[PDB]
Amino acid sequence: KKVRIAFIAVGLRGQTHVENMARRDDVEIVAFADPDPYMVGRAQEILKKNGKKPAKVFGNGNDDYKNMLKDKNIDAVFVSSPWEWHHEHGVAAMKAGKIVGMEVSGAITLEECWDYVKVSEQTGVPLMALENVCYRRDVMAILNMVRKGMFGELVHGTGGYQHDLRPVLFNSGINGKNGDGVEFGEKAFSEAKWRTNHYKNRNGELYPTHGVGPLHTMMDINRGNRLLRLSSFASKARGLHKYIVDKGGESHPNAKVEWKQGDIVTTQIQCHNGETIVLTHDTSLQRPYNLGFKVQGTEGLWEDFGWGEAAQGFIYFEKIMNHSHRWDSSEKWIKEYDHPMWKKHEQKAVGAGHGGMDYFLDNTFVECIKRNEAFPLDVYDLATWYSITPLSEKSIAENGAVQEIPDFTNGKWKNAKNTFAINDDY
Amino acid sequence: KKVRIAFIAVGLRGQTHVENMARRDDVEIVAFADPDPYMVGRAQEILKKNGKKPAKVFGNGNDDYKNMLKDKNIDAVFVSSPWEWHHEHGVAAMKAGKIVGMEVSGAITLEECWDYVKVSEQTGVPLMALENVCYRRDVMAILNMVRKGMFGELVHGTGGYQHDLRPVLFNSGINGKNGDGVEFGEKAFSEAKWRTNHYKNRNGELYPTHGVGPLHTMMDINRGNRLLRLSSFASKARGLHKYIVDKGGESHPNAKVEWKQGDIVTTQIQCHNGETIVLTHDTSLQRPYNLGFKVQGTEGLWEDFGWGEAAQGFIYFEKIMNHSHRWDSSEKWIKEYDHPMWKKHEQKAVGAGHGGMDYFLDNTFVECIKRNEAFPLDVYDLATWYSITPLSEKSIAENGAVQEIPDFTNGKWKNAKNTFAINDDY
Numbered sequence: 001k002k003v004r005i006a007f008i009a010v011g012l013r014g015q016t017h018v019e020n021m022a023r024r025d026d027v028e029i030v031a032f033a034d035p036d037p038y039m040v041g042r043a044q045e046i047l048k049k050n051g052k053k054p055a056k057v058f059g060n061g062n063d064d065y066k067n068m069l070k071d072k073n074i075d076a077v078f079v080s081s082p083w084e085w086h087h088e089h090g091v092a093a094m095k096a097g098k099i100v101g102m103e104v105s106g107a108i109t110l111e112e113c114w115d116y117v118k119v120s121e122q123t124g125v126p127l128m129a130l131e132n133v134c135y136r137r138d139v140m141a142i143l144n145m146v147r148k149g150m151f152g153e154l155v156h157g158t159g160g161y162q163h164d165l166r167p168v169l170f171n172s173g174i175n176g177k178n179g180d181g182v183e184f185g186e187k188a189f190s191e192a193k194w195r196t197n198h199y200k201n202r203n204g205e206l207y208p209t210h211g212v213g214p215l216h217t218m219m220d221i222n223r224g225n226r227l228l229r230l231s232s233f234a235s236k237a238r239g240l241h242k243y244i245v246d247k248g249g250e251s252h253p254n255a256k257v258e259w260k261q262g263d264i265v266t267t268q269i270q271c272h273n274g275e276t277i278v279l280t281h282d283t284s285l286q287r288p289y290n291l292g293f294k295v296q297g298t299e300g301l302w303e304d305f306g307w308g309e310a311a312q313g314f315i316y317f318e319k320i321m322n323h324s325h326r327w328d329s330s331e332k333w334i335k336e337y338d339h340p341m342w343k344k345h346e347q348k349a350v351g352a353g354h355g356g357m358d359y360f361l362d363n364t365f366v367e368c369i370k371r372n373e374a375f376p377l378d379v380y381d382l383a384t385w386y387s388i389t390p391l392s393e394k395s396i397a398e399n400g401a402v403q404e405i406p407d408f409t410n411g412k413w414k415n416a417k418n419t420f421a422i423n424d425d426y
Numbered sequence: 427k428k429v430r431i432a433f434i435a436v437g438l439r440g441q442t443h444v445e446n447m448a449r450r451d452d453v454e455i456v457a458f459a460d461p462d463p464y465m466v467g468r469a470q471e472i473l474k475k476n477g478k479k480p481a482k483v484f485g486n487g488n489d490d491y492k493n494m495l496k497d498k499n500i501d502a503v504f505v506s507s508p509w510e511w512h513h514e515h516g517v518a519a520m521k522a523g524k525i526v527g528m529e530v531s532g533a534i535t536l537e538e539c540w541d542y543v544k545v546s547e548q549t550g551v552p553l554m555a556l557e558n559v560c561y562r563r564d565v566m567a568i569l570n571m572v573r574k575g576m577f578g579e580l581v582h583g584t585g586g587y588q589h590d591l592r593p594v595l596f597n598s599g600i601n602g603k604n605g606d607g608v609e610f611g612e613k614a615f616s617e618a619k620w621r622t623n624h625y626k627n628r629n630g631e632l633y634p635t636h637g638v639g640p641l642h643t644m645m646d647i648n649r650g651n652r653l654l655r656l657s658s659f660a661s662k663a664r665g666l667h668k669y670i671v672d673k674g675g676e677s678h679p680n681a682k683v684e685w686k687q688g689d690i691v692t693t694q695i696q697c698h699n700g701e702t703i704v705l706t707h708d709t710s711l712q713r714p715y716n717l718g719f720k721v722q723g724t725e726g727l728w729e730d731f732g733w734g735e736a737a738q739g740f741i742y743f744e745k746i747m748n749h750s751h752r753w754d755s756s757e758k759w760i761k762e763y764d765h766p767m768w769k770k771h772e773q774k775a776v777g778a779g780h781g782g783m784d785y786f787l788d789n790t791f792v793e794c795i796k797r798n799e800a801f802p803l804d805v806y807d808l809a810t811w812y813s814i815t816p817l818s819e820k821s822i823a824e825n826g827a828v829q830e831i832p833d834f835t836n837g838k839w840k841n842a843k844n845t846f847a848i849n850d851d852y
């Protein structure tokens with residue numbers, strides 16, 4: 001009756017998924033696949049901490065996931081691997097008959113986006129885009145207000161991954177430590193080992209899901225609407241070089257690397273039903289954390305400035321606020337229109353509980369498997385968001401030229417219905 | 427010894443310029459040219475109120491400015507006419523040997539942008555772009571911080587004319603009244619008479635100067651940097667139709683007009699020295715007033731949410747703020763780094779004084795004439811900002827295709843020096 005789940009990659013983010021599953025007694029954690037013994041060790045400690053038995057470890061090189069996927073007992077897998085490993089891990093999972101929870105990122109190539117959907121359609125094995133910010137308390141509250149008609153008809157939104165990643169892109173290489181050095185690549189630890197190389201070799205919207213995901217759900221993208229085209233402008237890169245000099249001096253070998261990834265990459269996107277979206281990738285500069293959300297329609301306007309707390313935003317509703325022409329604090333609105341799912345299950349995610357928005361994301365994953373129902377953020381959505389990355393890179397190489405975004409649904413977007421957070425349970 | 431100034435167009439904005447000049451005893455207001463007797467009447471009342479003698483009125487049709495320009499006593503003129511009249515009024519002014527203060531807007535065509543500069547170079551008569559938001563107290567404070575090196579090297583900025591104009595684009599037609607009806611065109615009053623037609627017939631960045639101007643001064647545009655290219659995305663238009671129905675019912679003839687101007691138009695702009703700029707035109711929807719400024723560099727980040735007051739923003743300076751990773755209120759920073767010009771001349775613009783940012787703008791205009799010095803926002807800048815409009819329209823017609831922005835300076839941008847607000851007087 002319970003769901004048997006394994007993990008491909010149990011690094012820092014895979015470990016969060018391990019803790020979420022480890023806390024549920026409707027899930028048995030069967031196995032881990034990860035070639036790093038230190039990462040596996042803390043994942044196993046998360047298990048011991050929750051009173052669940054250890055997992056079978058597949059730590060023999062990069063290809064040992066192939067052997068874990070032969071386990072017929074395995075129902076579903078979480079893929080929390082580096083960006084370059086996403087496609088290989090997920091399709092091999094679906095081909096082995098394993099339902100996939102796919103961590104976010106962009107695609108390495110446009111080609112893998114199509115291979116996700118086409119492999120999933122052939123195998124009949126569904127895949128969930130694990131976009132956690134779609135389950136952020138304020139975002140879910142705003143979604144609820146949009147559905148209540150409080151924003152009227154939406155015309156425009158903004159959002160973006162705007163989060164200082166300098167302390168994560170560089171470290172010493174010591175296991176367990178970030179922001180303690182200027183090393184990246186083979187000798188560095190966690191994301192510095194692999195993510196930072198993408199900043200050296202590429203220039204584009206490398207991380208579009210956190211900003212676009214909320215807007216996707218609010219504007220019915222792939223569910224009565226879809227994304228038509230985009231154009232990407234990239235600023236110069238200055239922040240990663242400056243950080244390396246300020247932390248580890250001019251004498252470091254790494255002070256010599258020219259970074260291709262501009263500090264700010266902005267992407268304009270046209271939607272079928274008239275809306276427009278602007279994303280911003282901002283990870284190599286000093287700043288507070290803020291994804292820079294704007295949801296704007298004919299009767300409502302919301303803008304945030306924080307990391308998702310009720311009071312960390314501004315809101316204006318003309319007809320409800322007596323045409324005051326002044327921002328209200330978002331606080332009372334986010335609390336009044338807290339999504340039923342959060343109001344019901346709050347104490348599983350926060351307070352007594354744990355995980356926050358991540359609890360709710362992985363809860364949907366598990367409940368969709370148990371109930372044998374389609375994921376609300378599915379393989380078509382993954383492919384769509386993922387495609388923003390290679391198409392932004394092509395736009396930048398073509399000095400901002402407009403790239404057409406493919407329709408990965410082949411017409412299915414027209415009549416598909418929005419099933420994201422449409423009840424209070426999952 | 428004093429400057430003799432006339433006015434082409436004395437509508438509501440021209441009247442502000444009349445009041446500014448009327449309050450100075452280093453200026454004599456000689457004449458007005460305006461075919462609307464009601465507008466002339468309140469301009470004359472502004473004169474009587476300040477104890478200055480009445481002006482010669484040239485109110486005989488649209489072409490009566492041509493006769494006012496024959497007055498050899500006239501040193502300079504302010505042009506505060508409708509957008510479609512800007513080019514004709516300004517070049518005729520320069521050809522008559524009159525120094526021009528040009529009100530802001532965009533260009534009707536790309537062609538007039540070149541004609542401004544080429545007429546000014548031939549006649550030797552300079553023209554000032556009257557961008558008042560460049561003199562906004564918080565903006566001037568931020569400019570000062572940028573020049574002090576507090577933001578480090580700038581990579582990115584945002585800004586935009588985001589101001590609910592629905593009550594101005596439609597009125598009854600009664601003289602002196604806005605937001606009191608649903609009429610526009612020949613029977614409507616003030617800006618509803620002419621501006622609203624642009625929303626019917628065009629779709630683009632119709633008003634770029636308020637957002638781009640501050641960034642221009644901070645990034646040294648046309649003064650060691652310049653604008654390379656742009657791409658414009660337009661959302662659907664819904665807000666003007668909705669406003670007409672909510673105010674004057676479905677039965678109005680105007681409920682039938684399909685508006686071409688999308689509610690949100692965003693424009694990405696590449697700068698020569700690596701910076702990028704995103705503008706937003708937002709005038710046909712409910713919202714508080716906020717131009718949505720962002721100034722972002724390697725050591726500082728500023729974002730506003732208000733209409734320019736010290737506390738209406740957030741700021742983060744890594745090295746000065748102990749790497750707190752938290753927004754500070756902009757209040758103490760805007761006050762501490764108040765531009766010397768404001769600190770010195772505060773009481774001429776606010777408190778005992780009058781005009782605010784507009785006092786400082788028109789003060790620079792007058793002091794540059796008296797001193798026979800080049801304007802800091804000159805004819806090349808006008809042409810540049812103005813060009814954003816027709817090029818955005820072309821981009822939207824071409825589904826976001828990238829338009830090259832001309833170099834109106836012909837290489838002069840490389841060695842030209844930033845002279846905007848570089849002293850405490852003008």
Ligand SMILES: NC(=O)c1ccc[n+]([C@@H]2O[C@H](COP(=O)([O-])OP(=O)(O)OC[C@H]3O[C@@H](n4cnc5c(N)ncnc54)[C@H](O)[C@@H]3O)[C@@H](O)[C@H]2O)c1
Binds near residue numbers: 008012063080103131
């Ligand atoms: N949604 C979120 O809030 C969120 C947050 C952080 C990271 N992420 C995403 O999670 C993914 C991983 O990020 P991370 O922070 O955990 O990085 P990490 O370096 O800590 O984890 C990567 C792990 O993958 C393992 N790995 C590499 N190749 C493998 C292979 N071939 N087979 C099995 N395991 C392999 C590594 O040994 C490591 O343990 C990325 O896609 C990242 O963008 C998402």
Ligand SMILES: NC(=O)c1ccc[n+]([C@@H]2O[C@H](COP(=O)([O-])OP(=O)(O)OC[C@H]3O[C@@H](n4cnc5c(N)ncnc54)[C@H](O)[C@@H]3O)[C@@H](O)[C@H]2O)c1
Binds near residue numbers: 434438509
């Ligand atoms: N910088 C700012 O803060 C600011 C603010 C508002 C408006 N503006 C700009 O000022 C300009 C005018 O706007 P407004 O609000 O004063 O509009 P308005 O309708 O009140 O004024 C326009 C005036 O021009 C006159 N006019 C029209 N054709 C003329 C002609 N051929 N010769 C002489 N006069 C003529 C009209 O009779 C009217 O009095 C526009 O470019 C607008 O964008 C700037």
